[PDB]
Design a protein around this ligand. Sequence first.
Ligand SMILES: *[C@@H]1O[C@H](CO)[C@@H](O[C@@H]2O[C@H](CO)[C@@H](O)[C@H](O)[C@H]2NC(C)=O)[C@H](O)[C@H]1NC(C)=O
Ligand SMILES: *[C@@H]1O[C@H](CO)[C@@H](O)[C@H](O)[C@H]1NC(C)=O
Ligand SMILES: [Ca+2]
Ligand SMILES: [Ca+2]
Ligand SMILES: [Ca+2]
Ligand SMILES: [Ca+2]
Ligand SMILES: [Ca+2]
Ligand SMILES: [Ca+2]
Ligand SMILES: [Ca+2]
Ligand SMILES: [Ca+2]
Ligand SMILES: [Ca+2]
Ligand SMILES: [Ca+2]
Lengths: 346, 346
Amino acid sequence: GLDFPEYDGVDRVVNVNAKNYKNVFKKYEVLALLYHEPPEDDKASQRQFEMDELILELAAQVLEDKGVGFGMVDSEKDAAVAKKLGLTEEDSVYVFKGDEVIEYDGEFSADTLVEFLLDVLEDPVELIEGERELQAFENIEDDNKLIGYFKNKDSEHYKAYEDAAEEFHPYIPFFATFDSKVAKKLTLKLNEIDFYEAFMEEPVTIPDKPNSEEEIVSFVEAHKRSTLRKLKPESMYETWEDDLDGIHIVAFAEETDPDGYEFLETLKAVAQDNTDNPDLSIIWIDPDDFPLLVPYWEKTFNIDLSAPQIGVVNVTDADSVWMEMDDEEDLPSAEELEDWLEDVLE
Amino acid sequence: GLDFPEYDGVDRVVNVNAKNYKNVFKKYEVLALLYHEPPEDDKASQRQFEMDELILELAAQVLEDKGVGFGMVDSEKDAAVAKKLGLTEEDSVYVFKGDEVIEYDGEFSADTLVEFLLDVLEDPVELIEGERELQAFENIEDDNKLIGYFKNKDSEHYKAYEDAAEEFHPYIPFFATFDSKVAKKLTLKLNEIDFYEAFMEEPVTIPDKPNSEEEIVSFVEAHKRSTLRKLKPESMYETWEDDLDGIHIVAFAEETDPDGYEFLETLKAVAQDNTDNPDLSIIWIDPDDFPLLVPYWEKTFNIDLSAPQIGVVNVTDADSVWMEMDDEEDLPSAEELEDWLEDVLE
Ligand SMILES: *[C@@H]1O[C@H](CO)[C@@H](O[C@@H]2O[C@H](CO)[C@@H](O)[C@H](O)[C@H]2NC(C)=O)[C@H](O)[C@H]1NC(C)=O
Ligand SMILES: *[C@@H]1O[C@H](CO)[C@@H](O)[C@H](O)[C@H]1NC(C)=O
Ligand SMILES: [Ca+2]
Ligand SMILES: [Ca+2]
Ligand SMILES: [Ca+2]
Ligand SMILES: [Ca+2]
Ligand SMILES: [Ca+2]
Ligand SMILES: [Ca+2]
Ligand SMILES: [Ca+2]
Ligand SMILES: [Ca+2]
Ligand SMILES: [Ca+2]
Ligand SMILES: [Ca+2]
C-alpha cells in the first residue's frame, strides 16, 4: 500500500547571509530565522547544533507548500544581518510576517513550530457569524480572548482593534462579529470590547469605548497574566520566566484523566475566588503536553504524575514542596487548597 | 535562572555488533533496537539516516535513568546478530523486555517512542482497589480493555491472566481486582473476565470460566479489531495497514473541539449500532495527535480539518471521497451517517 509521508532528506533551511537576506524576506510571507552562536568545535556541541538544524528541516518540509521559509543567521559570520534585522537574543527564533516581528519563546520542536507558524499564517482577527462559531468561542478557556462588536470590516474602530490584535498574534486570540444577534448574547454594545481572562466565567469590558489601538494593547498588557495560566509549548519559556517572587505555584493535572479533570475543576474554582489578587498566578501543566519532561519531573520533584499534584517551586534551584494527597480518599477541595497555599507561603 | 533540560549531544545509541550484543542484552531491562538497512551514499538518504539516529539519541537521553537502552543493528554488517535476534522487518524498531519481543510498528518520533517505552516498563496487569481507581478504568474507551476478578495474586487463574497480558503489552491494558465490592459494580463472578471493546458501553464475558492463558489469548486475538478504532501514534502503521477490503472509513474529529466531540459521540453511536458487523471498521483520527500531517491531509483529501470529517479512502493511491457538511447547518446525525456510508459503498 501507499506509504505515509516521511522526511525526504532534502535541505530547505536557507543559510542567510548579507547577500541573500533581502531576497529571502520578499520570497516568503512568513519567515522563521534561528539566530545562533557559531557552533563550538567539540563533538557534543556539534551534535546539538545538528539536532536544531534537522528540526528546522523537518518543519520546512511540512510547511513548504504554505509558503513558510526557514533560515539561519550566525551571530558572528552574519553579524551585519543580525544588526539590520534586530536579532539580539542568542540561540533563539525570530518569526517575520510582513511587517510585524515575533520573538519566539516556546518549545523548540518540529511539532510546536509547525503549529505556531500555522497559527501565525492566520489573520489576526477571527470572525464569528453563525451560532456554532459563537459556541466555539464561548468554549475557549485556556487562552485569554477578546471579543468586539463593530459595524463593518471597514470601521475605523475595527482597524484599531485589528492593529492591536497584531501586537499579540497568535498567542492571544482576537474575535470580532458584525452580527447584532451574536453581540446581544454577549451583552456587547457597539464598538465595545470584552476581555475574557483564561478560566474565568465573567468577562471584563474595556472602559471608555470606542477603543484605540493603544487603549486595547495597554489593557491586554495589564490583564494578560491570568490568575490561572496553562503551560503551553508555544510559550513555555515566556510563562515560566515570568515568576512573581522567585517561585511558581505549579499544578500537574491530566485533563483526560478523571482524577485530573476533577482536580482541574477545583483549581478553576480557587482561581475564580482569588482572581483579583494581583500577585497570584498559578501554572497548570498537563503532563500529556510534555511527554519528554515527565521522567525529569518525577525525578526532580519526587512526585507521581499519574496522580494530580500541586506545589511551590523555587525557580532558582528547582527546590520544591508538594501537597500530599491520599490515593484512596477523595481529592482535596478548594477549602483544603486555599489553606495549603496560605500555610506554605506563611 | 535555572534552564529547562536540553539535548546534551552525548551519544548513547550503541552500535550493536557481534561482539557486544550479548553484553547489551544483559545491561538494560528494556532494549529498543533499530534494525536498519546500510545507509545509502547520496546526500538526502544520509540526512534521513541522520534524522533517525538523533531521534534515538534524544530518547536515549530521556530514558537513561529508567534503564532503557537504544541500539542500531545493520542488516549487512550485523547480519549474523539480526539472524540470532530475529530482526526481519527492515528499517523498523524491535523492543525487547526480558523474554518477550515487541515488533514496534508506530510513529518514529521521540515523543511517541518515549511514551511507548515508558508503558513497556509498566507491569502488564494494573490492579484496581478503591472507587477512584475503578472510575478511572470505566473512563477508558479508546483502548480495548480487559478486567478480571480473582482471589489474590497467588491464584492460579490470575497468573494465567497475567501471562496472557504479556502477549499484548502495552497495547491492550489488562486490569484485575481482588476487591469484592469492585467486582460487584462490574457484575463479575469470581475468575470471570470481561472484555470491553473500544468505544462500547457493554462488555463481552469470556465463556467457560475459569480461563487459561491460551483461552484468553485466543479470545483477545479474535476481538482486537474494534468496530471503531482510533489512530494512535504508538501503532498508527499497524492500524492503517489493516485494511478491511483495500479501503478505510476515515473520520477526522478533534476531541477537545465542541463540534468534534459531538461528531465523535455520533461516531460512537454508529459504531455501537453496528458493532456486530464483522466487516465494519472505522478509523478515527484526532488531528491534534498528528500536527505534522494536517497540511498533507488537507491537501490530499481537499478537506478542512478545523471541521469534523468522514470519508472513504482507497489505501492504494490515497484516493478518497468525503461527506460534504454545511458549515452553518447542524452536524449530521447517526442515521444521516449510516445513510451516507451505505450509499457510497453500495
Ligand atoms: C484503488 O485504486 C487502485 C489504483 O490506485 C485500483 O486498482 C486498479 O484497479 C483497476 C481496475 O479496478 C485495475 O485495472 C488496475 O490495474 C488497478 N491498479 C492497481 C495499482 O492496483 C483499485 O481498484 C482501487 N480500489 C477501489 C475499491 O476502487
Ligand atoms: C531558592 O533557593 C536559593 C538557593 O539556591 C535561596 O537562596 C532562595 O532563598 C530560595 N528562594 C526561596 C523563595 O526560598
Ligand atoms: Ca547563516
Ligand atoms: Ca493560540
Ligand atoms: Ca457589557
Ligand atoms: Ca475612548
Ligand atoms: Ca485575574
Ligand atoms: Ca549497528
Ligand atoms: Ca497502552
Ligand atoms: Ca457480568
Ligand atoms: Ca474452562
Ligand atoms: Ca465490534
